Write a protein that binds this ligand. Structure first.
Ligand SMILES: [Zn+2]
Ligand SMILES: [Zn+2]
Ligand SMILES: [Zn+2]
Ligand SMILES: [Zn+2]
Ligand SMILES: [Zn+2]
Ligand SMILES: [Zn+2]
Ligand SMILES: [Zn+2]
Ligand SMILES: [Zn+2]
Lengths: 276, 276, 276, 276
């Protein structure tokens, strides 16, 4: 019921200078952890369904699991398809009522990225769905080559995405060496592109930086690994202290609770607590 | 879609001398493990939703998770409420379309057990739902006091349950000492009561015995702990060999696969493989 | 979404001295007419699904049609099964989420009426569903024999229904001769039984009387025929003025609008306008 | 459940030389009439939801009403959006799971018609949905100007529609003067375009012609008015013979039955009877 468009949700966050957390879920406990956190914090949230889980559980199943856990949830929730490299898949998530989608054409040429992102964005706008795209390949944890201020402009204008993902120092996974953001590029994009920014790979970015990025117009911070670290630090404590504990409400329940904490941390860091 | 009444499903198993496995699920992977096994084995199955999971996830959520994973499932599935000690809860599961239910009044006097089991059985029959009850307190892992052949008769006649759970040597949890069934009582009940029997606490019963029990009219064997042992032997192998593995598709995916095996084992032991 | 228990809805009406209209629907337009009226009048309402429509369209279909028209409806709606003479049917409507039900055992002996009404009421209370029963056969349009004040008491106490239907001068269909209510019996029942009353066959009762009955504790007034008169006075005006008008949005659309008026009339007469 | 893609359904009809009837529904009875006919005739069918009903009942409601009446239906059904002049509306029907859609750009220039039809067709193909478009304005009941064989080719190639609607002598409504088809154009299109054809305004086309058109590659015949004529010839017989008949199961029930006949007529004429 309290499913809110992602255009609406990112825009509000932007206008009022907070970022919304995009928390990747992989199963039931994780979905619930996320929804519990947000509710306890009176915070709007995005649940992210990404390519990894999609291959395990499936698109449609995972939407339905999220739907199942929304009964006592009064705060704004938006379901987001992450890193879709397929128009069909983008079209599928729309069809089962995702409230936001991201078509990632970063591995395609400028022309082709733009052509498909636009096609998917036209559909999303038609049905009131937040639309994300990416310009600039974001890696996964050796000179340097970031995203142009101009590339961004043209991409944004050509695709009419609601929120733009740029490559700006983040990467996917447990960071080897503390990275550093191009706060400068962010400044320029803020002024040129006049659109909210998405930071991929915010797991492992120092808090200082995150809040600095949110100040330069970042309104969506994706969180995946940090949450799985926490969930796994839970499974472990229990499982390596007592391996003969067979109650999944404890072993994975403690995985959940610890991950619930991690979300609340991030909600606060992003400053959305209070904002429902 | 392929949800089949539990009256129908246990009766067929009984008539044709196999037992259906009642596999307790606690989350998504577990639900899927069960459904994968059954499908690979062309076997009808029961998914059990019991009081423990209900307190974690909820009745309605867990039914909806099962529904979500039924898209590619062609074999007969029945959803079973386990060990309900409440009429309201029994009525709730009916309302969201469980295909079987068990009201456990074993902790109530004969009169009160019968009165409520009957009330719930009247509702279940009305909407074509398999109905289970229990006479005789089944423990959880010191002289002896089993279920009377006559108690059984009166209980069965008074309640009109479809399948009867009797206390006959089983118990809930990791068995301390290899138990032994009253195959004799089973013989008498088979002849007197003329109704299928449910064996609670079949996790840890030697195979020989299980097949012997299925021969004396057991048509439903409940499996919970053994499945969680397996799922936890999975989480562990991965997690204690590599604690920095943060991919839940691996750590809990291997929990799933190992548990998928355990189900298939039991399906075969119970002899339902082939029977869709 | 805005589906409200009928125990809650009739009780509020009772406490605050208004009656809720129970409007029988037979198809889409009729369902919508009812929902449109109520919404325009900020009034809680009951949609009644009765034995006639059930035989045409079915229980489950008609609930789903009502569900389909609830998208823009913000006021309290309750779906009511009317004149069910079957436990199975009563149990079916519960299972697909009716918010009120009536088991009519008026054609059964006191003992049997009470036994089944009680059984159904136990289920309804369990799942928070308004429960209605009837004592005294209400006819369908020649000395006299109404409902006892004492019969009512015992019936009410034995069944624990939320709202009681008594035979008090009403009848089903286009009234041959202006009838007259036993306002006296109503007075006694009000004081003895301490429970809301349902008036069957309020189509064709003079307004004066209706408001008088609502004053003596009637909180539910059933409306069926008057609504079908109106809907048919619509189909006719159009169809007999222009028989070659083939647009169902006009011929049956005007059936709808005229019936929308009739509802609003009744909402006002019953005094629920404003009460959401 | 037995909802079948319209690409699949029209193609089979084409390959095997029958046409599928596209029957416009406006309410419950009409939906049911259609589904009853088809089922009695073991025939695949298309239910059409068009702009008129959409303004009365709404897209999403009408899909849900059709869903509600599909419980006992074993034959192939496809839900078709008719004469959509909006991308948003086309995208909406996809989102609630129509199995076929028609974007009508006949009132747009060649370039713009093609551009939007293509955009919608790309989405439809992505989610396995039959796609229809129109080249050549089809009127609604004075020299002559039909559809070019070449216009058709280019349109078809540019849009990749599954089935093409051409202007070929039909028109919407009660035909003033018996029209005549360009069977010749049909011949040419059959050979050039290699795609199934849709005949709009088949209500009032002599049977001879219909079967002749089906022979030249027409695989979809739209029926609306004839069905409403019949439904209204029903309402009338009853209503003008007895105006004081207030039972909607009779007055509109007889509207239904008569319309059920009309469908069966057409199913046979189109030759789909038997083909499930
Ligand atoms: Zn990313
Ligand atoms: Zn990325
Ligand atoms: Zn047990
Ligand atoms: Zn037990
Ligand atoms: Zn009545
Ligand atoms: Zn009555
Ligand atoms: Zn047309
Ligand atoms: Zn047309």
């Amino acid at each position: 019921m309290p499913y809110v468009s992602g255009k609406t949700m990112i825009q509000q966050a932007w206008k009022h200078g907070y970022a919304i957390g995009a928390f990747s879920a992989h199963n039931a406990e994780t979905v619930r952890a996320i929804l519990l956190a947000a509710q306890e914090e009176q915070s709007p949230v995005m649940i992210q369904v990404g390519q990894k889980v999609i291959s395990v559980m499936g698109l449609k199943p995972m939407k339905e699991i999220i739907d199942a856990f929304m009964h006592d949830i009064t705060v704004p929730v938006c379901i987001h398809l992450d890193h879709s490299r397929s128009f069909e898949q983008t079209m599928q998530a729309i069809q089962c009522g995702f409230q936001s989608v991201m078509f990632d054409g970063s591995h395609l040429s400028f022309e082709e990225n733009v052509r498909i992102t636009r096609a998917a964005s036209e559909v999303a706008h038609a049905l009131n769905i937040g639309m994300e795209g990416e310009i600039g390949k974001i890696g996964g944890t050796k000179d340097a080559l970031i995203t142009s201020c101009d590339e961004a402009l043209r991409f944004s204008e050509g695709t009419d995405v609601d929120y733009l993902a740029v490559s700006i120092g983040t990467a996917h996974g447990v960071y080897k060496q503390e990275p550093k953001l191009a706060f400068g590029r962010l400044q320029e994009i803020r002024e040129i592109v006049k659109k909210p920014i998405v930071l991929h790979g915010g797991s492992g970015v120092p808090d200082d930086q995150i809040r600095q990025a949110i100040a330069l117009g970042v309104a969506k911070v994706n969180v995946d690994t940090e949450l799985r670290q926490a969930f796994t630090q839970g499974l472990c404590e229990v499982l390596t202290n007592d391996p003969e504990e067979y109650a999944l409400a404890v072993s994975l329940g403690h995985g959940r609770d610890v991950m619930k904490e991690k979300v609340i941390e991030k909600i606060r860091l992003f400053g959305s607590n209070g904002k429902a």
